[PDB]
Amino acid sequence: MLLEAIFHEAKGSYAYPISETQLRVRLRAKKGDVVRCEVLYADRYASPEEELAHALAGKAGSDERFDYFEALLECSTKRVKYVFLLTGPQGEAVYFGETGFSAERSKAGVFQYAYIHRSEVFTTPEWAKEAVIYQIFPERFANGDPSNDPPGTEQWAKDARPRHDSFYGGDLKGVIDRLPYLEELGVTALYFTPIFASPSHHKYDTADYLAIDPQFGDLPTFRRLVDEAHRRGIKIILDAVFNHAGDQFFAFRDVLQKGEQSRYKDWFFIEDFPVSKTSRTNYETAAVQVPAMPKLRTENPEVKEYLFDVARFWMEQGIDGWRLDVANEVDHAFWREFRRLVKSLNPDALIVGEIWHDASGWLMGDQFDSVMNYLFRESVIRFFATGEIHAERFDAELTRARMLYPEQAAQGLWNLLDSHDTERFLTSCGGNEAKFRLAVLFQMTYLGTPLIYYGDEIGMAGATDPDCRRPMIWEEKEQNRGLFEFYKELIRLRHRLASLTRGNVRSWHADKQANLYAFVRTVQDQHVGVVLNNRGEKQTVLLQVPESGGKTWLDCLTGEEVHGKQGQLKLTLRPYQGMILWNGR
């Protein structure tokens, strides 16, 4: 076995506590090099001649190139040292520890998780563990008050095709007026893109962090939304853009006028004076050469304190969480402290980040609760929509992203299909609803938090920005109530099947030919196996089902009962059909 491909670390995503006396440990190895992984451990202060504890690490999954083994160590003393006993195909015994590899245990040394502090056990809000988030782009969701529509607002019709500068008048009132609809669907939370006062159309260049932009509504209106949403069981998540402020931001304005003599000169990253010029920026800004968005020096305590105050303000209005924008550019110190604050005001406030790359440094538990799961979108798009990859490959990408962070994070990653910055998934599937349904079926049964982009639930289509931001279709006649009802059912099943919300994920079957993928969600004794026939052909499949997990299963989508014989389940899936088999326990 290739010893240089085996990996572990007493930290990060490979060693972390799930409670004060339970330590989870993961081990990576060349796919196929290890067939049996066991952990021998003991208290760190245990006598040398003491009997070691045993814990078998079951194989948690495999990806494109590696195998991952996982074990749960019981540590009543909250202190543990451990060494891996890896067994290969030809029965070779190799010990693995901090010192390195060796046929003799003692020479391998041992890994150590010094101590488990409860304040360091990754914890996220309970409602978010079984939530269903709904993204709302205010300007295009619903116009509840025409009195606030800016000049040039265009007609609200299904045949309307937005342009970069188009205006439809969507506002908060609109949302309040539609909560009944959103309640019917079963969404548990609403996620709003920036909606704070700004002079631009997109509102990412914050003019006043303490006020709702006039075109969307006012503070009194926002409070009404918060409450009305709250009694329907819907939480509110606001989008915070702390990485940079807008060029209308009061503090920035003082710099544009007082320059060097500005009480806030150190609140930003300014090269030299005069403070500005057209087409040329002499101060750091968002991305590259964007004068409207001067970068904020979050490292500056005064800046820190203001942003925190901004945070305090809106949490006082009763919001439930924040989706951080371009957070990976704000110092960790800030986020570590932001968390501390946000949680102190409301232990149940959610903190979701947006980072387009391995976000581990932010998902250890002392910073964000989760991040947008773009890896999930890439995988479902290339698998369900374009077909660039087959089911077995789909399985790989899926497994790899999953082993990225600790389980507490994986469970609350937002699984999006699209957003206001990309084309609508139905478009991605080329108008093929049969494909859309299977992907939605997956989205609703996989590990993570399902996020629905406004309108997709009733069949809205569209190209990328700005064709993805078309006016919400409210004409019951123009809506795909068929698809809508589909979401309802799925959201329903996900709320009653504890396994779909808080269970683990283990691949069940993968076939590059049949392009059929199946996985099993498990929590306690309940098992729910999802089978995806991503192929336009009626197919039969024989699945392995060890009798231990049950002898009878129910397909929650058809009520059809399927029985297993001698460890096998014969399933017949119509073109692009998905099955949700509950073990009834």
Binding site for a copy of itself (CB under 8 A): 2-5, 7, 9-11, 29-31, 43, 45, 64-66, 77, 79, 98, 100, 111-112, 114-115, 117-120, 287-288, 299, 328-333, 336, 355-358, 360-361, 366
Is there binding between residue 166 and Ca ion (CB under 5 A)?
no
- 513, interface contact from a copy of itself, Ca ion, none, CB < 5-8 Å by kind: none
Q: Please, which residue, 11 or 481, has the CB nearer to a copy of itself?
A: 11
Q: Please, which residue, 65 or 538, has the CB nearer to a copy of itself?
A: 65
SS3 content of the chain, % helix, strand, coil (to 5): 30, 25, 45
Tokens of 86: 């890896």
- 366, interface contact from Ca ion, a copy of itself, none, CB < 5-8 Å by kind: a copy of itself
Binding piece for Ca ion, criterion CB under 5 A, among 38-46, 170-178, 241-249, 345-353: 170-178
Sign of CA dihedral 469, 473, 479, 483: positive
Sign of CA dihedral 87, 93, 97, 100: negative
Q: Please, which residue, 176 or 573, has the CB nearer to Ca ion?
A: 176
138: nearest Cα among 207, 195, 198? 195
Q: Please, which residue, 13 or 206, has the CB nearer to a copy of itself?
A: 13
Q: Please, which residue, 53 or 185, has the CB nearer to a copy of itself?
A: 53
The annotation status of 105 as a binding-site residue, yes or no, is no
The annotation status of 421 as a binding-site residue, yes or no, is yes
DSSP three-state, residue 190: strand
Is there binding between residue 169 and Ca ion (CB under 5 A)?
yes
Is there binding between residue 148 and Ca ion (CB under 5 A)?
yes
Alpha-carbon span 186 to 134, nearest angstrom: 10
Instruction: Tell the smallest beta-carbon distance from residue 115 to a copy of itself (Å).
Output: 4
Among 139, 171, 397, 555, binds Ca ion (CB under 5 A): 171
51 is catalytic: no
| Binding string, residues 439-478; x marks residues near Ca ion by CB under 5 A | ----------------------------------------
Instruction: Tell the smallest beta-carbon distance from residue 473 to Ca ion (Å).
Output: 17
Instruction: Tell the smallest beta-carbon distance from residue 265 to a copy of itself (Å).
Output: 17
Tokens of 549: 């997990």
The annotation status of 54 as a binding-site residue, yes or no, is no
Is there binding between residue 62 and Ca ion (CB under 5 A)?
no
The annotation status of 469 as a binding-site residue, yes or no, is yes
Instruction: Tell the smallest beta-carbon distance from residue 232 to a copy of itself (Å).
Output: 37
Alpha-carbon span 313 to 294, nearest angstrom: 23
Tokens of 1: 């076995």
- 117, interface contact from Ca ion, a copy of itself, none, CB < 5-8 Å by kind: a copy of itself
The annotation status of 213 as a binding-site residue, yes or no, is no
Is there binding between residue 139 and Ca ion (CB under 5 A)?
no
Q: Are 483 and 448 in contact (CB under 8 A)?
A: no
The annotation status of 149 as a binding-site residue, yes or no, is yes
The annotation status of 148 as a binding-site residue, yes or no, is yes
Tokens of 182: 């959103």
Per DSSP, helices labelled H in 154-290 are 172-185, 219-230, 250-258
Q: Please, which residue, 79 or 232, has the CB nearer to a copy of itself?
A: 79
* Catalytic position from the list 154, 208, 337, 354: 354
- 66, interface contact from Ca ion, a copy of itself, none, CB < 5-8 Å by kind: a copy of itself
Per DSSP, helices labelled H in 317-461 are 332-345, 374-380, 391-402, 407-410, 425-428, 433-443
Is there binding between residue 489 and Ca ion (CB under 5 A)?
no
Query: What is the DSSP secondary-structure string of 539-570?
Result: EEEEEE--GGG-SEEEETTT--EEEEETTEEE
CA distance to 323, 353, 408, 438, per residue, from 414 (Å): 10, 10, 13, 18
Instruction: Tell the smallest beta-carbon distance from residue 373 to a copy of itself (Å).
Output: 15
Q: List phi, psi (to 5°) of 517.
A: -125, 145
Instruction: Tell the smallest beta-carbon distance from residue 245 to a copy of itself (Å).
Output: 16
Among 145, 284, 378, 465, binds Ca ion (CB under 5 A): 145
Instruction: Tell the smallest beta-carbon distance from residue 442 to a copy of itself (Å).
Output: 22
478 is catalytic: no
Q: Are 373 and 381 in contact (CB under 8 A)?
A: no
Tokens of 287: 């991305």
- 329, interface contact from Ca ion, a copy of itself, none, CB < 5-8 Å by kind: a copy of itself
Q: Work out the number of other CB atoms within 10 angstroms of the CB of residue 544.
A: 10
* Catalytic position from the list 67, 205, 213, 325: 325
Q: Please, which residue, 111 or 222, has the CB nearer to a copy of itself?
A: 111
CA angle 465, 321, 197 (to 5 degrees): 55
Which residues does 68 contact at the CB level (< 8 Å), separation at least 6?
26, 27, 28, 29, 59, 60, 61, 62, 399, 403
373: nearest Cα among 283, 303, 457, 448? 448
Q: Please, which residue, 300 or 432, has the CB nearer to a copy of itself?
A: 300
Instruction: Tell the smallest beta-carbon distance from residue 283 to a copy of itself (Å).
Output: 14
Alpha-carbon span 279 to 95, nearest angstrom: 62
583: nearest Cα among 449, 569, 575, 59? 569
DSSP three-state, residue 581: strand
204: nearest Cα among 251, 169, 162, 242? 242
- 348, interface contact from a copy of itself, Ca ion, none, CB < 5-8 Å by kind: none
Is there binding between residue 97 and Ca ion (CB under 5 A)?
no
Helix axes 172-185, 219-230, angle to 10 degrees: 10
Tokens of 55: 């814990």
The annotation status of 171 as a binding-site residue, yes or no, is yes
- 537, interface contact from Ca ion, a copy of itself, none, CB < 5-8 Å by kind: none
Is there binding between residue 329 and Ca ion (CB under 5 A)?
no
End-to-end CA distance of the chain: 40
Q: Which residues pair with 235 in a beta bridge?
A: 189
Tokens of 489: 């059912």
The annotation status of 504 as a binding-site residue, yes or no, is no
The annotation status of 169 as a binding-site residue, yes or no, is yes
Which residues form the catalytic set? 325, 354
Q: Which residues are annotated as a binding site?
A: 143, 145, 148-149, 169, 171, 244, 323, 420-421, 465, 469
Q: Which residues are annotated as a binding site for Ca(2+)?
A: 143, 145, 148-149, 169, 171
Q: Which residues are annotated as a binding site for substrate?
A: 244, 323, 420-421, 465, 469
Chain positions contacting Ca ion, by CB under 5 A: 143, 145, 148-149, 169, 171
